[PDB]
Design a protein around this ligand. Structure first.
Ligand code: P9X
Lengths: 228, 57, 291, 340
């Protein structure tokens, strides 16, 4: 400082101003909630995002609720290998997963024999047991229940699940599907799975997301302080 | 219909990548060794540099 | 004789040497071991430092100092009298006990308040607070503790009762000195704050479900554990002080024969305030899954 | 499908002929030829500088041609240019998309480039009329994430992407002049030759290819690895290149002999290589690993001549200056360290 010239002093003050700006940007960005949105082609991600907000690549949606700033990252356009970029999202508050439970009898357009629900279960198994998401909470959304109620009356669930043994009532079938999904969680000690049944007019999904995020943040604070 | 076209493309690639001049391994190894030993004195990490001409003191 | 006018009798009892020194030495050994091992773990075995760890560090330091300055009073009881050391290392020790105990109480309250803000208000700016501000808060708290304790340093604390010299601060006298007021005050208000924070934590965490994880269930008990530990460690002393004040008001400073039993009980219960310093690493430092 | 079967048989015969020619040209091995070479002394470098300021993981870095300035990219949406001599920060460019995966420095020192999951290669102007930095171009022709980019001139740039293609661009126009479509897997790295007439790339198909910039055709194909290729570097002479993969091995290939020459592996190492680089004379091969530290290899004897261990997380990038004075390493713990 004392021996520095004028040019060195100018460089030092420029560096100090840059550091101040970097610190303020980091502090501002540390108070937001980051969410990763996953699903399939017709899971119903767009329908959820429709009431959430109220070039391929990655598209980001920002919305505010109860003085919290959220940020969703949809990565459905990326058709490359998932293992080469999935570690960039290590450190998100939670993962939102969308499943269309009205597609138990429909089949994939690409491959006829494989069911859509089985593919969704395989994707959920891969994501949930990933080594980069050992202790990341998952919010599970089951989307098309309005069509599920109609399609379960005239069709049996045994098509997708031949080992199903129960009545074809909507409640029992939905509960069975929920237990089938929650059974794939092989940690049960580091992460929690939140399941919600929604429709095209539920208009209360943001409150559920807020509650799950609050629980996750409380758990993080308790882990930081020493308890839990 | 395009499968035969892609197969022809692959055959073309293997055709005009299999006709080149390939030297022996010994000559390439000798050239690498000669280049490494020719610039040995110019490498500032192979040999420790005096602190007089070290910008990172 | 007399202690700066204000005619008030002081008592010496031989019963202390029979009971206290062994228990007090065991408490000192346990506290020293716990504090030393905790300091060794925190100072070098850990790298990630947060606000909670910073606030716990000062409590550990205060407990360590309180345990360290104790053999001086071991000597006071084994030799039973005369405070052989001198005069300055009497004001010094009566300063370094009161300051250490008040710091321990203050840092316990601060830890409880931090937990309450972490649980009840998860989205708050106080939760995301820099280590620099934590250091400023710690320095301010230490300064407040020292400023409140320094009252005893600029005075004289010797009595010279006949052939025996007593190094005491709790002198039974019809006076409203700041020492007794501080002793009464530093219990009830922190007790209320701790109880309020604990009740809010338990209620808010219970109504919000969160019982499946079972580490939440493990940690929901430690709050009440530390609350009851504080209660049992700091209730008898203030109870005996209240009884002493009542007896002094209802009987005056004359007839110096009833105060014997209550003074003996007060000196028995004053050793309870050193019991928390050895349990503090157990229920605050080794009771966490962090290490 | 008889014609398809006979075509497959012809391709198999061609592959067998190529393999037989490669075997025939292998008269000896480099390791036994280099037997009478004095082993390099145990290299021991020290952390001369430590650059702080990034608040998230660091994914890429690149040295300037003056061997004094460097640029680094982080997932907090920042592109910082550092002065390596005095640690001072010269610029701090904010990015529209924070998911950056690579960055580059122009040889003239006038531009920097970066890209990531947005599939865009953004180009910034460093020397402008004012004291600020503004976006100069945005190349938007790729359909997958962009993984590497290198400058040929102030008006040309070569990029690689996750759509199994590499492309050559024109900054002032903005269109893909040439496209390279040989690969069948995601391309993760590329390296230009010193004369900027050739470049090599390594993809997820465990193979590397050599391309001609002017023509647009693959000349040679190199195999031998067992898993993903994460980094590639090109020998200072210009007739060889080194490849680092996920099977905890590094290999050296010769362009003129057109086959693998020598491999660098150790039994204790089980983690993958994230970055490789050569020294000025080409004697030392520096490689970054997943086990949080860098290893220095002897390029002629495959002997570990040193270890660079100063990082708490994965080492994601490293580079050696043009004059060979220092080597810088970046890591996921958000720190840059300069060794010497
Ligand atoms: C009994 C006492 C003492 C006795 C002898 C020498 C020093 C201190 O312990 C303290 C205390 O813990 O606050 C007050 C005291 O008067």
């Amino acid at each position: 400082g004392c021996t520095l010239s004028a040019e060195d002093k100018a460089a030092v003050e420029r560096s100090k101003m840059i550091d101040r700006n970097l610190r303020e940007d980091g502090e501002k960005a540390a108070r937001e909630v980051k969410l990763l949105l996953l699903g399939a082609g017709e899971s119903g991600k767009n329908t959820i995002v429709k009431q959430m907000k109220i070039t391929t690549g990655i598209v980001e949606t920002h919305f505010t609720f109860k003085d919290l700033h959220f940020k969703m990252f949809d990565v459905g356009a990326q058709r490359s290998e998932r293992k080469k970029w999935i570690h960039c999202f290590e450190g998100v508050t939670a993962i939102i997963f969308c499943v269309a439970l009205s597609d138990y009898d429909l089949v994939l357009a690409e491959d006829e024999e494989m069911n859509r629900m089985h593919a969704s279960m395989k994707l959920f198994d891969s994501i949930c047991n990933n080594k980069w998401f050992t202790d990341t909470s998952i919010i599970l959304f089951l989307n098309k229940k309005d069509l599920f109620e109609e399609k379960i009356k005239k069709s049996p669930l045994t098509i997708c699940y031949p080992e199903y043994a129960g009545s074809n009532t909507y409640e029992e079938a939905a509960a069975y599907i929920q237990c089938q999904f929650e059974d794939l969680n092989k940690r049960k000690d580091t992460k929690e799975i939140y399941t919600h049944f929604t429709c095209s007019t539920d208009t209360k999904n943001v409150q559920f997301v807020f509650d799950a995020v609050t629980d996750v943040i409380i758990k993080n604070n308790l882990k930081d302080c020493g308890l839990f | 219909t395009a499968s035969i076209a892609q197969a022809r493309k692959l055959v073309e690639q293997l055709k005009m990548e299999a006709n080149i001049d390939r030297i022996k391994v010994s000559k390439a190894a000798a050239d690498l060794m000669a280049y490494c030993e020719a610039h040995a004195k110019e490498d500032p990490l192979l040999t420790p540099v005096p602190a007089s001409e070290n910008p990172f003191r | 004789l007399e202690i700066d006018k204000k005619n008030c009798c002081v008592f010496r009892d031989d019963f202390i040497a029979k009971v206290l020194p062994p228990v007090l030495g065991l408490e000192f050994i346990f506290g020293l071991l716990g504090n030393g091992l905790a300091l060794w773990i925190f100072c070098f075995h850990l790298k990630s430092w947060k606000s909670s760890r910073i606030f716990l560090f000062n409590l550990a330091v205060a407990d360590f100092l309180l345990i360290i300055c104790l053999p001086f009073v071991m000597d006071y009881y084994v030799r039973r009298s005369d405070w052989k050391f001198g005069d300055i290392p009497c004001r010094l020790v009566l300063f370094m006990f009161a300051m250490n105990r008040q710091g321990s109480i203050i840092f316990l309250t601060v830890v409880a308040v931090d937990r309450y803000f972490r649980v009840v208000h998860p989205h708050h700016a106080l939760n995301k607070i820099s280590n620099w501000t934590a250091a400023i808060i710690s320095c301010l708290l230490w300064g407040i503790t020292v400023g409140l304790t320094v009252h005893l340093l600029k005075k004289k604390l010797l009595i010279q009762n006949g052939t025996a010299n007593v190094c005491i601060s709790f002198s039974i006298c019809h006076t409203f000195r700041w020492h007794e007021a501080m002793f009464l005050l530093e219990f009830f208000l922190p007790l209320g704050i701790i109880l309020f924070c604990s009740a809010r934590i338990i209620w808010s965490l219970r109504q919000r479900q969160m019982d499946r994880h079972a580490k939440i269930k493990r940690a929901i008990t430690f709050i009440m554990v530390v609350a009851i530990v504080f209660v049992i460690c700091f209730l008898p002393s203030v109870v005996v002080r209240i009884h002493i004040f009542w007896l002094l008001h209802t009987s005056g400073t004359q007839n110096c024969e009833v105060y014997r039993s209550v003074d003996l009980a007060f000196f028995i219960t004053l050793s309870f305030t050193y019991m928390n310093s050895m349990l503090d690493p157990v229920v605050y430092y080794f009771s966490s899954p962090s290490f | 499908q008889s014609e398809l079967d006979q075509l497959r048989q012809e391709a198999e015969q061609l592959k067998n002929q190529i393999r037989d020619a490669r075997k025939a040209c292998a008269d000896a091995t480099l390791s036994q030829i280099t037997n009478n070479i004095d082993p390099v002394g145990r290299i021991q470098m020290r952390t001369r500088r430590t650059l702080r300021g990034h608040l998230a993981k660091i994914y890429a870095m690149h040295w300037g041609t003056d061997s004094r300035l460097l640029v680094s990219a982080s997932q907090d949406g920042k592109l910082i240019i550092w002065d390596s001599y005095t640690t001072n920060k010269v610029h701090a460019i904010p990015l529209r998309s924070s998911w950056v995966m690579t960055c580059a420095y122009a040889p003239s020192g006038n531009y920097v480039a970066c890209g990531g999951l947005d599939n865009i290669c953004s180009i910034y102007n460093l020397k402008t009329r004012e004291g600020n930095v503004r976006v100069s171009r945005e190349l938007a022709g790729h359909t997958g994430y962009l993984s590497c980019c290198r400058f040929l001139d102030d008006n040309q740039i070569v990029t690689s992407s996750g759509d199994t293609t590499c492309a050559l661009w024109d900054i002032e126009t903005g269109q893909q002049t040439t496209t390279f479509t040989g690969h069948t897997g995601d391309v993760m790295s590329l390296s230009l030759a010193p004369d900027t007439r050739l470049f090599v790339s390594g993809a997820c198909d465990a193979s590397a290819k050599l391309w001609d910039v002017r023509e647009g055709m693959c000349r040679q194909t190199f195999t031998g690895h067992e898993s993903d290729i994460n980094a590639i570097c090109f020998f200072p002479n210009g007739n060889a290149f080194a490849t680092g993969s996920d099977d905890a091995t590094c290999r050296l290939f010769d362009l003129r002999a057109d086959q693998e020459l020598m491999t660098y592996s150790h039994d204790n190492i089980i983690c993958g290589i994230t970055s490789v680089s050569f020294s000025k004379s080409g004697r030392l091969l520096l490689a970054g690993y997943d086990d949080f530290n860098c290893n220095v290899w002897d390029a002629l004897k495959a002997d570990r001549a040193g270890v660079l261990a100063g990082h708490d997380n994965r080492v994601s990038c490293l580079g050696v200056t043009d004059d060979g004075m220092a080597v810088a390493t970046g890591s996921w713990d958000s720190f840059l360290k300069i060794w010497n």
